[PDB]
Amino acid sequence: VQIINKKLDLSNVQSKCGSKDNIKHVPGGGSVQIVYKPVDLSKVTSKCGSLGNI
Amino acid sequence: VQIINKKLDLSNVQSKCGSKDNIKHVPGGGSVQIVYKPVDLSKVTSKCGSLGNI
Amino acid sequence: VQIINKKLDLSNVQSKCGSKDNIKHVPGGGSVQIVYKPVDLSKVTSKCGSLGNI
Amino acid sequence: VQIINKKLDLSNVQSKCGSKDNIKHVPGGGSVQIVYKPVDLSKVTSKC
Amino acid sequence: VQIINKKLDLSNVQSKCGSKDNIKHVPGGGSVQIVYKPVDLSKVTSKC
Amino acid sequence: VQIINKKLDLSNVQSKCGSKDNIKHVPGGGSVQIVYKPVDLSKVTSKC
């Protein structure tokens, strides 16, 4: 047996925001789950001369 | 047995936002699940001279 | 046995937004699931001189 | 407004097994996923 | 507004097993995932 | 506004086991995940 795994991210990013998840990885049944009026009001501005590799 | 796996991302991104997911990976039955009035009002602006590789 | 797998993303993107998913990967039966009045009012602007590879 | 989610379990069961599941709810791609020789040899018996 | 989530369990069960599950709710991709020879040999018995 | 989450367990059970699960709620990608020869040999018995 030989197992090889390779996961590669070589991103260039000017503005990056992580996720906004409310009720996540919550096992077991028999419950009341309410996500009530979640709101995103956010403002993102990105301004650039150049971004990739040269 | 030989197993080779390769996942590759070479992205260039100006503005990046992760997901906005409400009730996610919630196993087990017998429940009340409500997502009530989720709202996105967000503003994203991107402005650029060049973006890819040169 | 030889297994080779390869997933490749070479994207250039000015503005990128992830998912907006309300009730996702929620197994087990016998439940009441409501997604009630989800709204997207968000505004995206992208403006560019050039974007691909040169 | 009424939301009622209701269960009455009055069952008679010898064995209740909810699942025997190998690769369940696995979102991302770009993966090698192998389920190799899953076996069920379980025995459920009543004698009287 | 009423939300009622309600279980009555009056069951008679010899064996209750909620699951026997190997790789489960695993979001990330770019992975090697192997379930190799899972076996159930369990014995549930009534004599009378 | 009423939210009621309610359980009436009046069950009779000989053996109750919530789960027998190996790799469970594991968000990270780029991983190697092997479940190798999980065996259930459990014995549940009534004699009368």
From Swiss-Prot, chains A, B, C:
Function: Promotes microtubule assembly and stability, and might be involved in the establishment and maintenance of neuronal polarity. The C-terminus binds axonal microtubules while the N-terminus binds neural plasma membrane components, suggesting that tau functions as a linker protein between both. Axonal polarity is predetermined by TAU/MAPT localization (in the neuronal cell) in the domain of the cell body defined by the centrosome. The short isoforms allow plasticity of the cytoskeleton whereas the longer isoforms may preferentially play a role in its stabilization.
The encoding gene: MAPT
Annotated positions of the N6-acetyllysine modification: 7, 16, 24, 37, 43, 47
Disease tied to this entry: In Alzheimer disease, the neuronal cytoskeleton in the brain is progressively disrupted and replaced by tangles of paired helical filaments (PHF) and straight filaments, mainly composed of hyperphosphorylated forms of TAU (PHF-TAU or AD P-TAU). O-GlcNAcylation is greatly reduced in Alzheimer disease brain cerebral cortex leading to an increase in TAU/MAPT phosphorylations. Frontotemporal dementia 1: A form of dementia characterized by pathologic finding of frontotemporal lobar degeneration, presenile dementia with behavioral changes, deterioration of cognitive capacities and loss of memory. In some cases, parkinsonian symptoms are prominent. Neuropathological changes include frontotemporal atrophy often associated with atrophy of the basal ganglia, substantia nigra, amygdala. In most cases, protein tau deposits are found in glial cells and/or neurons.
Tissue: Expressed in neurons. Isoform PNS-tau is expressed in the peripheral nervous system while the others are expressed in the central nervous system.
Assembly notes: Interacts with MARK1, MARK2, MARK3 and MARK4. Interacts with PSMC2 through SQSTM1. Interacts with SQSTM1 when polyubiquitinated. Interacts with FKBP4. Binds to CSNK1D. Interacts with SGK1. Interacts with PIN1. Interacts with LRRK2. Interacts with LRP1, leading to endocytosis; this interaction is reduced in the presence of LRPAP1/RAP.
Stated name of the protein: Microtubule-associated protein tau
Modified residues (Phosphoserine): 11, 19, 31, 50
Glycosylation sites: 6-7
Domain-related comment: The tau/MAP repeat binds to tubulin. Type I isoforms contain 3 repeats while type II isoforms contain 4 repeats.
Deamidated asparagine: modified positions: 5
Site features described as Not glycated, chain residue numbers: 16, 20, 24, 37, 43, 47
Tau/MAP repeats: 1-31, 32-54
Paired cysteines (S-S): 17-48
Subcellular location: Cytoplasm, Cytosol; Cell membrane; Cytoplasm, Cytoskeleton; Cell projection, Axon
Cross-link for Glycyl lysine isopeptide (Lys-Gly) (interchain with G-Cter in ubiquitin), residue positions: 7, 24, 37, 43, 47
Post-translational modification: Phosphorylation at serine and threonine residues in S-P or T-P motifs by proline-directed protein kinases (PDPK1, CDK1, CDK5, GSK3, MAPK) (only 2-3 sites per protein in interphase, seven-fold increase in mitosis, and in the form associated with paired helical filaments (PHF-tau)), and at serine residues in K-X-G-S motifs by MAP/microtubule affinity-regulating kinase (MARK1, MARK2, MARK3 or MARK4), causing detachment from microtubules, and their disassembly. Phosphorylation decreases with age.
Modified residues (N6,N6-dimethyllysine): 37
TM annotation in the entry: none
Residues shown, of full length: 592 to 645 of 758
